Write a structure and sequence with these properties.
heterotetramer; A mainly alpha; B mainly beta; C mainly beta; A: mainly alpha; Hepatitis B viral capsid (hbcag) fold; C: mainly beta; 7-stranded mixed β-sheet; 11 strands; RNA binding (chain D)
């Protein structure tokens, strides 16, 4: 019932991150695949975020299959466009968030992710008049 | 249930000049899908009606670009850039937000006499 | 392009009841709805009723509410409109159409048929 | 290029051989997950990958239900809704039923016996009905 609980994070902690400042889907897909294909392919079972990413990719595959099927049938042309737009735009926010989180911890280390995530909340809260110009990156 | 309205009742156009016709509806047509259910129809003497604009702001297939329209909410307008000799007819606007469906009053066009 | 042809129109003696024929072909009747349009001379179009693909639901306007009924036979893909208690205000040409732009505006309109009531012949 | 069961030593075909009737209803699986494993489901623990799969399946299917409700509300054409809801509920949910049963069973009895039950069921089904023994093998305890 809690998406992330067991990583020392909360759904409310991610609220401070605005929805718009996330990365695009295909970038996260590529970043996971190219870098960590070997990690995906192993007999070792540990760091459950590995399995979590395996569930995320499966869910995305199923949604894409639904999208193509709708593209195939569904006689009204519009309803089709409405459903396609909804699945493309609204449907991917949660998966995108999941991929960002898991890659971030998957890339560097958890403590570095938790630090970045609590610090970034500072940037949005400060006023533009005296806010520092640049925002915090995950770095490494 | 819905009261429909059209204006002006008549409009004679010298052909080759633009013209605009306005149709108004009482209740809002913005559904939760971001779309507006409003129609533009064309009717010719001795012939069946033909479609002009669909879904409020999308042109029906096969319709020439000479006709265009836009608008949202309770206000819409039909605009024709260039009037051709074959454009004479009576135009209608319709509502499809809530059943039962209601039609307008009509708008007939002609050529201004000398 | 789909082509629809009606039949059964003509003159009917006053006080009786008549049934009009509107058949369609070239598209999936089970996947789309149907509508009825009327035009007495001197006025414009007026919506009357419609039926959904299943046929379980239907709607009517207050002018003819409770006196007209519509039904479909998916076996032969033919529309049906039954008229009872006809009046002098019902003399008009009837059109059956189909709408598929997301269930809002009619797309293909049939040729229509006129119905006339009077005592002289 | 993903073998979800490979991390436990099983393959997709093992379950694909299982007919649809065998899996229970979705409500049954959700009720079992709620009643029998809620205490440790939310709590943090190490290893226990099955917990992580169950947790993400519950979110996925909740999102699917939200989609079903949203399409029911809007979607002005009256027919499409039947086809959409049918595909979302009966066809797509099969994989969810597939995964939920696998993992729930794995939690109660562990890999030791479920794999053998699977191989035995496959052996039983493969043969024709004429020489098939009376009844399908039961997992038992």
């Amino acid at each position: 019932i809690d998406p992330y609980k067991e990583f020392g994070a909360s759904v409310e902690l991610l609220s401070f991150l605005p929805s718009d400042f996330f990365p695009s889907i295909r970038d996260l897909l590529d970043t996971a695949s190219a870098l960590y294909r070997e990690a995906l392919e192993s007999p070792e079972h540990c760091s459950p975020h590995h399995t979590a990413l395996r569930q995320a990719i499966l869910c995305w595959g199923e949604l894409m299959n639904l999208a193509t099927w709708v593209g195939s049938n569904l006689e009204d042309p519009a309803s089709r466009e409405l459903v396609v737009s909804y699945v493309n735009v609204n449907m991917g926010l949660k998966i995108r968030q999941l991929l960002w989180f898991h890659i971030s911890c998957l890339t560097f280390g958890r403590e570095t992710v938790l630090e970045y995530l609590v610090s970034f909340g500072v940037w949005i809260r400060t006023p533009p008049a005296y806010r520092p110009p640049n925002a915090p990156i995950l770095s490494t | 249930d819905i009261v429909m309205t059209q204006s002006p009742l008549s409009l004679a156009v010298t052909p080759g000049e633009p013209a605009s016709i306005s149709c108004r509806s009482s209740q809002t047509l913005l559904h939760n899908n971001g779309y507006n259910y409003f129609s533009w129809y064309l009717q010719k003497p001795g012939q069946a009606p033909q479609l002009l604009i669909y879904l409020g702001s999308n042109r029906a297939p096969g319709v020439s670009d000479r006709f265009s329209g836009s608008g949202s909410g309770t206000s819409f307008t039909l605009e024709i850039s260039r009037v051709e000799a074959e454009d004479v007819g009576v135009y209608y606007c319709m509502q499809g937000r809530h059943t039962p469906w209601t039609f307008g009053q009509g708008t007939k066009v002609e050529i201004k006499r000398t | 392009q789909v082509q629809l042809v009606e039949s059964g129109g003509g003159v009917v003696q006053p006080g009786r009841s008549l049934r009009l024929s509107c058949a369609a072909s070239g598209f999936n009747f089970n996947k789309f709805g149907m509508h009825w349009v009327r035009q007495v001379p001197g006025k414009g179009l007026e919506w009357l009723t419609y039926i959904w693909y299943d046929g379980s639901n239907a709607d009517y306007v207050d002018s003819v509410k409770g006196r007209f009924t519509i039904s479909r036979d998916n076996s032969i893909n033919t529309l049906y409109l039954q008229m009872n208690s006809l009046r002098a205000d019902d003399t008009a040409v009837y059109f059956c159409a189909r709408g598929f732009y997301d269930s809002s505006s009619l797309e293909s309109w049939g040729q229509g048929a006129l119905v006339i009531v009077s005592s002289a012949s």
